Structures are given as C-alpha cells and as structure tokens.
Structure 1
Amino acid sequence: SLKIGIVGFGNFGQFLAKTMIKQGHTLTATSRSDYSELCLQMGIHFFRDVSAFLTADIDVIVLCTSILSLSEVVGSMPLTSLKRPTLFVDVLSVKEHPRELLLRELPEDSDILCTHPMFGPQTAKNGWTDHTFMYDKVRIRDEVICSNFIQIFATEGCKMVQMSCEEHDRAAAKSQFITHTIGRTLGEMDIQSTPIDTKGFETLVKLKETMMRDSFDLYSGLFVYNRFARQELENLEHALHKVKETLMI
C-alpha cells in the first residue's frame, strides 16, 4: 500500500487514479483546475494548493500533466518543502523530455521513474491486461518503493517493458505519432461511414474517432518534444507524395 499523489488530475490522471484506488493505495491529487467535487465523488482528498499537497505524507508523486505544460508545472512547485526524499514518476507520452527536465530540476535526493503506459481510456476501458507499460529506472535508490509502484501495473496484467527514454521516443515517433497524425488527418477530412464501407475503411473511421478523443495538447506534445517525430512526419508526407506521383503519371 502506497501513498500516491497525482499532479494533474485530468483525463489520464483520473484514469490512473481509479485503478490505484481499487488496489488499496491512498490517493491524493492537486491540479491547475479545481477537482474538489470529483475527488469528493471518488473518495480522495484534493489539494487546491500545491504547497499543502507537497508537505503531506506522500511516498510517490505521479506527474500526469500535459507534455506541453510539464516545465511550467515543475517550475511552480516548492520542491524544497518535501518532507522526505520522494519518488517522482512521470507518465508523459514522450520520455526524453521529462527525463532531462526532472534530472535538472528535482532535488537530487528525489528518485525518478520515467514511464509511458501505452494505453488509456480509449483502449483499456475494461482493464490493463496485455497492454504495454514502458518504464526507465532513471534515478532509483529506494528500490522497494519503486518496485511497489511498478507492481501496480504488473498485477493488472500489463506487458512490462524496460527500455531507455531515447529508444522509447525513437519507436514512439514511428508508431504512436504516425498513428495520431493519420487519425487527425482523417478528422480534418471528417470521414463518415457509408452503406458500402469496406472493413478497412471501418477501421479507419474507428481510428479517427479514438484518436480525436485525445487533446490537441497531447498530440502536439508528441511532435514538439520528441526529437525523432519531425523526420517521421517527413517520411509520411514524402511517401504520400510518391504514391500520388505513381497515380498522376
């Protein structure tokens, strides 16, 4: 049982909180917007003031804010007020950025665990089993607390993948970022089902619908803060152009 504080209690913060509560951990939260009533509903304590959140009795701080805002959020936190050395976990969709920034900004005696649960409310509605949880033990000295946190995902059946933040971003730029870009592009075309949909087109409509559920902040953070994304955007754009020219001749 862990005392887990969520920083950024939005869509994915709430998603993680439901399962950690179910396992019996003690959850608290803080966020830019006021989630007092939703935390009341869920049965957890919300701290309108980040300073009171950080002086509380807390084993793990999970950074669930948007990629775009992480630097501002960490910058606004009075981290010297931490009672104890504390494990910091990030769940951002890109990994080199939070690794670099937490190593730079956190107090040195705070541990760092960089993760990406490769799933969320769209793909893992009825549980985490067989979805991938990527993690990088960036700066761990309390292996007990870190293992307790990682076990949250192991006991839910996740496929557990240790890899560096760099290898994550290289792979994510080719897969997740391309998938979102295609979903977003179909969203601007506003593709719609017809009476003669093929199965392939049905999957694309569904892919469009699920990708459009993520914020534009999230999508844009995949591009801005993954140094490998720009070339994958080029690869996609160049390939489409080459396909077009085989048709145009």
Structure 2
Amino acid sequence: SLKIGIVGFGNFGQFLAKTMIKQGHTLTATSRSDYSELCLQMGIHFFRDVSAFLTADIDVIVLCTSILSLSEVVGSMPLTSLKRPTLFVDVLSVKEHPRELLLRELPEDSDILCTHPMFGPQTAKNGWTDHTFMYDKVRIRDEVICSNFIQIFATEGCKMVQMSCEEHDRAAAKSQFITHTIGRTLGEMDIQSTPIDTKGFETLVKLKETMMRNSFDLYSGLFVYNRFARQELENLEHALHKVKETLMIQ
C-alpha cells in the first residue's frame, strides 16, 4: 500500500503525486518529456524510457497522459515487458475511449480500473474534501489492490461515485464539456472586470480564468473522444439562437 507508477508526469500527474506522496505511497514515474529534477525533488523514481519503467516494482500503473495521446502511448508500450499482472488505472476526462482501448490492448490477466477525479489544480487547491471521484471497475479480480487504490481518494474525503464509462460520458458531455465551452468562449472574447460587475459576471470571469488554465489538448479531447459532446455543442448553439431570436422579436 502502494507502489504506484505514473505514466505522463505533466500537470495532472504532478497533482496526484503530491497527495499520494503525502499519504506515504512509493511513486515511480515516466513521461515523454524530462522530469528528472522535479522527481528528484519529490523522491519519485523517474524512468525516461517506458520500457525501463515497465520493469520496475509496481502494484499500480496510472495512465495520466492527455486524452488525444492515450492511443499512441499505450500502443507503443512494450506490454510484453510486464513482469506481473498489474492493475492499470486511467484518469482521463473521458471514459469510453480508454475503456475500449485498454480492453483491446492490455494483457488479459491485467486488471482495469477506469476513473475520473472531477477536480484538479485549479479547483482543488486546498484539499480534495467534498470533490467528486468517479470510477468504474471495468475488469477487477484483485479486489485488495483495487480497494487500496480507490482508498487514496476516499480517505481524502472525496464523494465516491461508481458509474459506467458510458454514463460518465453522457453526463460529462452535458456538464463539464459545456462548462469548458463557455469558459473558452469567454476567453476568446477576453472578458475583463469592470467597476460595476455583478456577482454573476464576477462568477463568469473566474470561470474564464480557470477554464483557460487547462491545455487546449485537454479541451479538444473532451470533444473528439466523447461521442455525446457534438450534440451538446449543437444544443448550446441552438439555445443561444433561440434567445437571440426572442430578443429580435422584442
């Protein structure tokens, strides 16, 4: 409890590491880019080469690369260099895609846990308490290891939500994707504070600031790999034109 290897040590991978290190887990990391110095600072063992990574002593592998790159990343991995059957955890913001991919590409005897912490650096600055953690036990035999990993979030007092990947994607297309879409639209407008802001407008400016601090890759992945996203983008445009037209009538 627990030796954890992180694939993709960018913004979100780092976020998770800080709390897992605090709880006492032993971390290993690997990534496309060089995080040697940062991992040195944090006492994480960093492997630049993913084949070297897969030979380390690891209970759990956490996939933390961008949605867009997950196919490339998993596809290149020498999964035949896996030393034991391992638990694979993804933390992608969309869920049907990693689920099908990992089911197709991973060795059969390896376990699959699909997850999405509904929070991050911009929204969980202090702690994780009363933030939501979604997960789906896609292929779990070793309940002990699975339970240990899931406990990482429970003991931070996350709200715990078990849900299918498809139901996560339907619900996320109608909520998170719309939320990001609005934040970006406001970012494209570059809204600015005024002397006479309303509470509502202050709220939108803060949403703009937060949504824009995510990568464009992340936002795109929400759309490209969520099959329910396109319809929500449509409903959003269709609703704005309904309001616009009632204004024209008036």
Question: Which TM-score band applies after superposition, normalised by the shorter structure?
Answer: over 0.9
Deviations 1:28-74 (A, max 9, x none): 10000000001011111110111110011100000000000000000
Equivalents in 1 of 2:105, 2:99: separation in Å? 10
Structure 1 residue 108: Cα displacement = 0.6
Deviations 1:68-119 (A, max 9, x none): 0000000110011111000000000000000000000001111000000000
Deviations 1:197-217 (A, max 9, x none): 001000000000000011000
Equivalents in 2 of 1:35, 1:200: separation in Å? 40
Deviations 1:183-240 (A, max 9, x none): 0000000000000000100000000000001100000000000000000000000000
SS at match of 1:119: coil
Deviations 1:109-158 (A, max 9, x none): 11000000000001101110000000000000001000000000000000
Q: Say yes or no: does 1:52 pair with 2:57.
A: no
Equivalents in 2 of 1:4, 1:48: separation in Å? 16
TM-score, normalised to structure 1, is 0.99
Equivalents in 2 of 1:229, 1:44: separation in Å? 37
Equivalents in 1 of 2:20, 2:76: separation in Å? 26
Equivalents in 2 of 1:55, 1:40: separation in Å? 20
Which deviates the most, 89-98 or 41-50? 41-50
Equivalents in 2 of 1:29, 1:57: separation in Å? 12
Equivalents in 2 of 1:216, 1:123: separation in Å? 18
SS at match of 2:168: helix
Partner of 1:116: 116
Moved over 4 A (4+): none
Equivalents in 2 of 1:231, 1:125: separation in Å? 32
SS at match of 1:114: strand
Equivalents in 2 of 1:223, 1:130: separation in Å? 27
SS at match of 1:55: coil
Structure 1 residue 3: Cα displacement = 0.4
RMSD: 0.4
- Between the two proteins, the alignment pairs up a number of residues equal to 249
Equivalents in 2 of 1:14, 1:43: separation in Å? 12
SS at match of 2:54: helix
Equivalents in 1 of 2:35, 2:85: separation in Å? 27
Equivalents in 2 of 1:78, 1:140: separation in Å? 22
Equivalents in 2 of 1:183, 1:90: separation in Å? 25
* Identity score, percent: 100
Structure 1 segments unaligned to the other structure (5+ residues): none
Structure 1 residue 245: Cα displacement = 0.3
Equivalents in 2 of 1:19, 1:69: separation in Å? 25
Structure 1 residue 242: Cα displacement = 0.6
Equivalents in 1 of 2:189, 2:49: separation in Å? 43
Structure 2 segments unaligned to the other structure (5+ residues): none
Structure 1 residue 180: Cα displacement = 0.1
Equivalents in 2 of 1:162, 1:209: separation in Å? 30
Equivalents in 2 of 1:60, 1:181: separation in Å? 33
